[PDB]
Amino acid sequence: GSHQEYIKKVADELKENSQNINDLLKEVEKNPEDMEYWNKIYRLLHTNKEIAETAGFSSVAKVEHTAMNLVDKMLNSEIKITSDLIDKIKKKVDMSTREIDKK
C-alpha cells in the first residue's frame, strides 16, 4: 500500500546516500587526511539522519548520529585519524545499511 511505498522510497534515498558515503570512503582511504572527503561524508550522514528521523527510521538515525560524532571530531582535529578509526566508521556505515534494510 501507499505506506509501504513511502517507506521503500525513504529507504531508497537513505541507501543512495549511504552508497555515496561508501564511494567517498574508497577515495579517502587512499588519502586519510583529505578533509574534502570527510566534510562531504559528514554532510551526507547529517542528511541521512534527518531523513531517517522524519520517517521513523529511529535505529538508522541513531547510527548515523554516532558516525557523525566521530567524523565531527576528525574535522575539528579532536581525534587522530587512524586505520582503526576509519574501520570504526566503516562498521557504523555498514550497520546503518543493515538497519535501513530492516525497515
Q: How many whole angstroms separate alpha carbon 86 and alpha carbon 91?
A: 9
Contacts of 35 (CB under 8 A, 6+ apart): 75
Does residue 93 contact residue 23 with C-beta atoms inside 8 Å?
A: no
Resolution of the experimental model in angstroms, please?
1.3
What angle, 0 to 180 degrees and rounded to 10, lies between the N-to-C axes of helices 58-75 and 83-102?
A: 160
Whole-angstrom distance, CA of residue 89 vs CA of residue 63? 10
Q: How far apart are CA 84 and CA 48, in angstroms?
A: 24
Residue 43: C-alpha distances to residues 2, 8, 10, 37 (Å): 29, 22, 18, 10
C-alpha cell at 17: 546516500
